[PDB]
Amino acid sequence: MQLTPFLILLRKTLEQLQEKDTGNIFSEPVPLSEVPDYLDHIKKPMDFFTMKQNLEAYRYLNFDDFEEDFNLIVSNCLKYNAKDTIFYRAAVRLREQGGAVLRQARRQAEKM
Ligand SMILES: CC(=O)c1c[nH]c2ccccc12
């Protein structure tokens, strides 16, 4: 299995996931200056910009590596934000719509 086609696939998949986050609330790290209690609750922050950096640093070499960080984006947001917020429901929506993107992309990776 070759590295370059796999990274091309992950780049495309990341772009498709970012397209689902229409408010761009997951595009960059949660601003810790605005939420000093965030790290009291969240052990490993994650966001799409950090994922892009990890991808280009060759830190994702299987689909699980990539999907685990996506799941952190979702789970951190569900954990930190109250159920009655836009942010919480945006993580639900991203889990649902992004899971579909991920299933098709993992299938492409399995074809490699
Ligand atoms: C994705 C997320 O939880 C957040 C994204 N931006 C934020 C700002 C304040 C509190 C939380 C957030």
Swiss-Prot record:
High levels in testis. This is Peregrin. Acetylated by KAT6A. Scaffold subunit of various histone acetyltransferase (HAT) complexes, such as the MOZ/MORF and HBO1 complexes, which have a histone H3 acetyltransferase activity. Plays a key role in HBO1 complex by directing KAT7/HBO1 specificity towards histone H3 'Lys-14' acetylation (H3K14ac). Some HAT complexes preferentially mediate histone H3 'Lys-23' (H3K23ac) acetylation. Positively regulates the transcription of RUNX1 and RUNX2. It comes from the Eukaryota. Coiled coil: none annotated. It is found in: Nucleus; Chromosome; Cytoplasm. It is linked to Intellectual developmental disorder with dysmorphic facies and ptosis: An autosomal dominant neurodevelopmental disorder characterized by delayed psychomotor development, intellectual disability, delayed language, and facial dysmorphisms, most notably ptosis. Additional features may include poor growth, hypotonia, and seizures. Residues 1-105 form the Bromo domain. Component of some HBO1 complex composed of KAT7/HBO1, MEAF6, ING5, and BRPF1. Component of the MOZ/MORF complex composed at least of ING5, KAT6A, KAT6B, MEAF6 and one of BRPF1, BRD1/BRPF2 and BRPF3. Interacts (via PHD-type zinc finger domains) with unmethylated histone H3 at 'Lys-4' (H3K4me0). Interacts with trimethylated 'Lys-36' of histone H3 (H3K36me3). Interacts with ING5; interaction directs BRPF1 to H4K4me3-enriched chromatin at the 5' of active genes. Interacts with KAT7.
